[PDB]
Design a protein around this ligand. Structure first.
Ligand code: HEC
Ligand code: HEC
Lengths: 104, 104
């Protein structure tokens, strides 16, 4: 495929949760350097779900083609995001803002 | 709670998928203006999951406190994001970029 086009997709759809750079940080999702030819759930230092840990397949063009079409269908139980707010005080403050902004 | 603090949480944790402004657009998630005192799944023009459509509760401080702690526990079946790429050519181009960047 077209690398130029792929880079833009990555930046728009994936970079908010993944880095690709050697030595790049884990974010919501794992750093992806060295992905190709590696089994699922094997970035060093990242805590996966059991589902992503145990999928047991090798990442390559064919498996990525299928995964990317629908990640949850290829790895049921995978979790991409936690959209909540665990701290009580942060929940109270956020709700205060929402109470104001969603009514003005 | 503290509105100043809530605004920053919102911008950091929620604004990527929700607007709060009257007349604001639906994004990944619904526009949230008029939320308080309204039942779940009722922003006009947004297509919810059946789960969020049918939760049947009224949004207010107490219900938001519980929802925000863990959205999926409060509304099982709710879906926050699709992280995949439906178009075949976009998948091919993205995979080409990944093949380069994750190996250099
Ligand atoms: C956050 C909201 C994410 C977005 C957007 C994308 N991904 Fe993701 N990805 C995310 C998490 C939390 C995980 C771990 C999931 C688990 O169940 O533990 C993943 C996983 C991957 C993988 C597999 C990685 C591995 O097995 O080592 C791949 C190949 C992957 N993600 C790629 C990817 C791409 C290309 C994305 C843009 C289209 C993308 N993800 C979006 C979090 C998030
Ligand atoms: C995208 C990755 C999201 C992030 C981050 C947050 N939310 Fe969200 N939210 C999202 C979607 C797709 C939906 C609809 C879900 C469905 O099952 O149909 C929601 C829903 C809400 C609701 C309920 C809205 C209603 O019933 O009308 C609320 C109150 C809500 N979201 C608030 C919210 C806040 C405060 C967030 C930051 C902490 C937040 N969401 C993150 C998508 C995403």
């Amino acid at each position: 495929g077209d690398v130029e086009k792929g880079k833009k997709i990555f930046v728009q759809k994936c970079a908010q949760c993944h880095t690709v750079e050697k030595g790049g940080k884990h974010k919501t999702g794992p750093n992806l350097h060295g992905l190709f030819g590696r089994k699922t759930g094997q970035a060093p230092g990242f805590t996966y779900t059991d589902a992503n840990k145990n999928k047991g397949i090798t990442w390559k063009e064919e498996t990525l083609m299928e995964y990317l079409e629908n990640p949850k269908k290829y790895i049921p139980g995978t979790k991409m995001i936690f959209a909540g707010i665990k701290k009580k005080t942060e929940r109270e403050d956020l709700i205060a803002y929402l109470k104001k902004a969603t009514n003005e």
